[PDB]
Amino acid sequence: NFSTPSGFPEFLPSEKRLELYLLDTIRRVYESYGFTPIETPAVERLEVLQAKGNQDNIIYGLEPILEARALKFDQTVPLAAYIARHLNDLTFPFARYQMDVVFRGERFRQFRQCDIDVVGREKLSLLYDAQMPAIITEIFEAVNIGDFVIRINNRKVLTGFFQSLNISETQIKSCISIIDNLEVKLELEKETQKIIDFVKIDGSVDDVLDKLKHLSQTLSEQFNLGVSELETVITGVRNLGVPDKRFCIDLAIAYYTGTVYETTLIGHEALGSICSGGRYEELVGTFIGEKMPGVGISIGLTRLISRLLKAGILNTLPPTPAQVVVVNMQDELMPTYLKVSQQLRQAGLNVITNFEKRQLGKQFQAADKQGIRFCVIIGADEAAAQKSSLKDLQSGEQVEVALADLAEEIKRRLT
Amino acid sequence: KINFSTPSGFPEFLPSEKRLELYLLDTIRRVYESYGFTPIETPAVERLEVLQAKGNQNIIYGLEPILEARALKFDQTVPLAAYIARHLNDLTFPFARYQMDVVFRGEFRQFRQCDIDVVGREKLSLLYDAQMPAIITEIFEAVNIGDFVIRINNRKVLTGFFQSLNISETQIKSCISIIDNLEKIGEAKVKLELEKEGINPEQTQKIIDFVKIDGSVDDVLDKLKHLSQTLPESEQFNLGVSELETVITGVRNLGVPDKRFCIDLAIARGLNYYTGTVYETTLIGHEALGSICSGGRYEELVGTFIGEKMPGVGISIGLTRLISRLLKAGILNTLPPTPAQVVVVNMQDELMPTYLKVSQQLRQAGLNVITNFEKRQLGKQFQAADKQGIRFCVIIGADEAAAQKSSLKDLQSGEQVEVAADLAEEIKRRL
């Protein structure tokens, strides 16, 4: 049974090239904002992965086949461990990206996460929170999947509002999150509705902010600062040129102590958040043995790809990176084919030399089935005249080109 | 009182070495893709039947959950076979793939391998074998770590030679295995070890004279052809010689110069795997590091679940090991801990909107930029940036902000220049 173990997915070449292209894209934006790569081991000391209630997740222990060890289930704990090991060698605030696969037991058992986090030592400017929506907008605009809104909220607001009613404290942590799945609950009084009208608040960013500042006088220390930090970040997001159609305040969103983001595809709301995160005070620093402010966002890429492909939002790529095939027209000309392929490669092009002996029709068929755009036909006459015939398999165009010009001709047809 | 360090043998880089790793991965990948190799990634975890199959298991790490037998991959060639089996009807053949996954071995218990293989259906052109030294050459010319020699052989020539001496298949394997240790244990010891395998003094001299054949590619090919005529009843020897000549000519036509390769009749790489061309790559003056890239043709290793004869050829770079080695030896230099090239300093907090805008603009020009938020005096910001190896600082002060202007401090040249609208162009210009 050569099958993949259940829950461990695997891309066909088309789909993996798509993932690589998205990964390249995300990496470009991450690095634009100064985020540095780290890759932590797949395997961690069990004591690290559980330390102070870290493991509801079934995790995977490792036994040798001829000291306790398990596979990471997220990237957040590894971040904490990482900073601990390299504390004196890092720059702060530490701005990192991580694109490792992680492992959970049950619907994917193995999936890739694309996280960025900035961690500071005693404090962390809010402008790190303002950068995140700028980061999210650039990624998903480049990725070309339709329009999206980044829903912003501050944990201090919703909770600062909660205290006004004076809910019991063992009961409040119980009825703080069961209000999320309102997607007028009577099984909430045993865990009145004044809070519903608040998470219902629907308006433009400046207006919602104004109703918040207006509500301030009515009630609220926490509420007040949450609204304040909600403004500083929003002004930041504007100063960084993020257009107003790309974000909104959504007070119903829900470790996090401040800024919180969720990202929704417009008209594809049922796929949930395609990018999430926010601000924490103690989620990293477990092993530092102290308090560390951070802001981070995460893209479950494996998850995102399967959902986006299945909904026809995302198009796969050709199964090959090759843009050009040098076809085999005659055996005696193989040295020429080898040479020309290397010339095209030198000019930056991705090339395949056909090695088999088959007629031109099948070489054409094979190159098009694989999504390769150009065929470079050189038979006896072409080679003697130091020329080639260029076939565009997509347009159907066919044109004669000097070998000296071939590489620049193909390139301007791609550009 | 927890201990947070990695488990023994699971290395992990600092930002600087991670940035070097990724730069190398980008370089390798670019070369692979120019020859049309496509990427795949198989799961870290496979079924235990698959990993143990055909006896081709090396200590491996199984998995039982902590509240169907399966294990972490230990090489990339088994997964590739299992991959072809799973997608047989969806792949194009010859199937050319690159794979850059981590693998796990117990004795580095985790290390990355950068592999390419072309796998064919019934037959595979020797021209795929010829591309490999071309691919190797391009890779280590880009990496830029000194000259190197791709040593090439063919198993049919080695096995074929032993067959002409009339020794059992079994003696041949253990002879090839002694020949594989020739450099380490020396000729005198090779002679003794051959004798312990039943090999007589005439056969012994012939063996050592053969594996020590050394000259230009053409004289080595000539000598082999002369041996062909002399012992004209090793059809395997003749086929090997033929194959080796096909690969060399292809290498040459691919424009690989002669200085980059030679024939090494002693390459005795994989016991039961390789059937044809074999490669090993030496960094001139650094043989202590061993091969920096090996591989070869294998006629019956990927059929594992197929049941078809599926010839393949591949090469491999143990990138984790090679990084540790090149770094320990001083051959390779690390990269700055940050991909940033520019820092917009914080002069006055009323000028954020301007810093933020100029950051995005520089970013839109394709530069990597860190906007400094925390406000300290000019000096401290230069020093914190220079410690990180960021080259450029954008200084937009009080009156400098007014006339749509800035001063930029290049921290390599230690020089400051007044530049507005033009900044991004003059940063790239001096970069």
Curated annotation (Swiss-Prot), chain B:
Alphabetized, the UniProt keywords read:
Aminoacyl-tRNA synthetase, ATP-binding, Cytoplasm, Ligase, Nucleotide-binding, Protein biosynthesis
The record's CDD domains line, in alphabetical order, gives: HisRS-like_core, HisRS_anticodon
Protein name stated in the entry: Histidine--tRNA ligase
Keyword ATP-binding found: yes
Q: Which family does it belong to?
A: Belongs to the class-II aminoacyl-tRNA synthetase family.
| Cellular localisation | Cytoplasm
Q: What does the record give as the reaction this protein catalyses?
A: tRNA(His) + L-histidine + ATP = L-histidyl-tRNA(His) + AMP + diphosphate + H(+)
Quote one Gene Ontology molecular function term: ATP binding
Pfam families (alphabetical): HGTP_anticodon, tRNA-synt_His
Which domain of life does this protein belong to?
A: Bacteria
**Listed PROSITE patterns:** AA_TRNA_LIGASE_II
Species for this entry: Nostoc sp. (strain PCC 7120 / SAG 25.82 / UTEX 2576)
Q: Name one GO cellular component term.
A: cytoplasm
Broad EC category: ligase
* Enzyme Commission number(s): 6.1.1.21
Give the main localization category: cytoplasm
Q: Which GO terms describe its biological process?
A: histidyl-tRNA aminoacylation
- Give the matching HAMAP family: His_tRNA_synth
Subunit (UniProt): Homodimer.
Query: What NCBIfam families does the entry give?
Result: hisS
